[PDB]
């Protein structure tokens, strides 16, 4: 029950293949709710979530305007960056911009973060006090200077602490049907013999939301326990996430292997044993 | 909602 509103902007140059590609996506919690993409038929901010479907054209116009603004400035910003790093016009390069507000369980504002990256590396990073930057670089130090003068108006603090929070609280009330619904994982164990000496136990969590889960394996006995293979959480492609953990156990010993699952959709942690 | 930049780099 620790909630977020976060935006992810990507800009990528294409020397003599048009002007730079620009893409924006917004997230409440682990649900994407909006896209903008300056190529695709309509160069407009669009809903990616059934609950955004009944905001009127006021909302979309503002967000479309905000996007073209960010796009067109990032086209400029790439040329600047190309300048400070002295890189040719033929090279493609990448500017990324990310920010979010985080609430606690109680709806108390917890943290703001905003951050820029050039060609993969950290470029310019907003500080704790939300009114001052750290630049990784000699070149970034130029951009540090320019972003302090203008953000003496505390534009980030204003957004992150206030506008970002207010709108989080708004998106939560609109989506609640789907978003504040805790979907506990459908959980089962699978057995995959290797030799007569050993099988693999695989503990599955399937079709759960939010995406914060813990899959741990433990063994009753004093015996050794081979390293668990945890696969990284992965989208079903329908809102929900999947995860699994796997051990190889000596054949015979499979009923001493208990798999615990922690998730907020679960009243209390479930424990799960293979049963053929 | 997002926000457009006010400065540049």
């Amino acid at each position: 029950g620790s909630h977020s509103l976060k935006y992810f902007h990507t800009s990528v140059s294409r020397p003599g293949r048009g002007e730079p590609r620009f893409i924006s996506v917004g997230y409440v919690d682990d649900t994407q709710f909006v896209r903008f993409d300056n190529d695709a038929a309509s160069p407009r901010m669009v809903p990616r979530a059934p609950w955004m479907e009944q905001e009127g054209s006021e909302y979309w116009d503002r967000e479309t305007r905000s996007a073209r603004d960010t796009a067109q400035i990032f086209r400029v910003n790439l040329r600047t960056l190309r300048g400070y790093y002295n890189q040719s016009e033929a090279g493609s390069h990448t500017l990324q911009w990310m920010h979010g507000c985080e609430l606690g369980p109680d709806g108390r504002f917890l943290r703001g973060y905003e951050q820029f990256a050039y060609d993969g590396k950290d470029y310019l990073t907003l500080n704790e006090d939300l009114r001052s930057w750290t630049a990784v670089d000699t070149a970034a130090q130029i951009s540090e200077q320019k972003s302090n003068d203008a953000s003496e108006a505390e534009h980030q603090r204003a957004y992150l602490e206030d506008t970002c929070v207010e709108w989080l609280h708004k998106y939560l009330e609109k989506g609640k049907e789907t978003l504040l619904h805790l979907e506990p994982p459908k959980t089962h164990v699978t057995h995959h013999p290797i030799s007569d000496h050993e099988a693999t136990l695989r503990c599955w969590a399937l079709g759960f939301y939010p995406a914060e889960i813990t899959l741990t394996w433990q063994q009753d006995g004093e015996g050794h326990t081979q390293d668990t293979e945890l696969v990284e959480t992965r989208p079903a492609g329908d809102g929900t996430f999947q995860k699994w953990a796997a051990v190889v156990v000596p054949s015979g010993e499979e009923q001493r292997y208990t798999c615990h699952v922690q998730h907020e959709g679960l009243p209390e942690p479930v424990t799960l044993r293979w049963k053929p | 909602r997002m926000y457009s930049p006010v400065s540049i780099l």
Epitope: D61, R65, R68, D69, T70, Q72, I73, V76, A150, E152, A153, E154, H155, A158, Y159, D162, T163 | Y3, S4, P5, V6, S7, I8
Partner: T-cell receptor
Framework: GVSQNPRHKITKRGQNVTFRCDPI?????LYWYRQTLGQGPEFLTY????????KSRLLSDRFSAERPKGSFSTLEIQRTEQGDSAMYLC???????????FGSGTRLTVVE | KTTQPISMDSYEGQEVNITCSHN???????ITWYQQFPSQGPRFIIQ???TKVTNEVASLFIPADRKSSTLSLPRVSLSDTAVYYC?????????????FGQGTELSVKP
């Protein structure tokens, strides 16, 4: 800077006029303001590229802006009146704030 | 929305203090001042939120109450003789759609 064509216009009452603005290149926003004597500029309209966004509540449908190609813009006043006689200021920016620059203006006098 | 002085009277080499009046200013609205020389279009000089600011051109002071701020011109010249307008708002809702008052006609005499 912002450049305005022409710097001076006279026009007989009841007749049309068309000023033009050529913004700082790379500025994606262009705004039209109207300034009479001893008064701050009133906002008339603006554009993101060629898209004419918000258009003032108090604006005559005589007044009407165009920015085809999202570069230069032309303000057009139809069937001119006395009150119309005022400085028409143009402005260009890079998004909501940066590089906000005003042109020098086009002075309009409507003679009876 | 904000009132200032319709005009103000100065002598060369002095320091001049125009004060904007914004009692109902929003919590995140900031204060940004333009300078329009006779004939030419208005020019940005200084913007401030709550911290005092200081550029070549001038300095802006804001008190806690934040109900009024005060642009301060150093060693004022004959050239520095313009209308000085005070805008109160935010790009974020404004859209770069500036709202000007009457401003304050500054005279400088020798």
């Amino acid at each position: 800077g912002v450049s305005q064509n022409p710097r001076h216009k006279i026009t007989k009452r009841g007749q049309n006029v068309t000023f033009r603005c050529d913004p700082i290149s790379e500025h994606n926003r262009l705004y039209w303001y109207r300034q009479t004597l001893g008064q701050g500029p009133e906002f008339l309209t603006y554009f993101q590229n060629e898209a004419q966004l918000e258009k003032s509540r108090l604006l005559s449908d005589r007044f009407s802006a165009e920015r085809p190609k999202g570069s230069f813009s032309t303000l057009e006043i139809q069937r001119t009146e006395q009150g119309d006689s005022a400085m028409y200021l143009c402005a260009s920016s890079l998004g909501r704030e940066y590089g906000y620059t005003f042109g020098s203006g086009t002075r309009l006098t409507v003679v009876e | 929305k904000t009132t200032q002085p319709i005009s103000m009277d100065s002598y060369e080499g002095q320091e001049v203090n125009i004060t904007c009046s914004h009692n109902n200013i929003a919590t995140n609205d900031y204060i940004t001042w333009y300078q329009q020389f006779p004939s030419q279009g208005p020019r940005f000089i200084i913007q401030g939120y709550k911290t005092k600011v200081t550029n070549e051109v001038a300095s802006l002071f804001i008190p806690a109450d934040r109900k009024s701020s005060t642009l301060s011109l150093p060693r004022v010249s004959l050239s520095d003789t313009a209308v000085y307008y005070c805008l109160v708002g935010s790009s974020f809702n404004q859209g770069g759609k500036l709202i000007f008052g009457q401003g304050t006609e500054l005279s400088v005499k020798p």
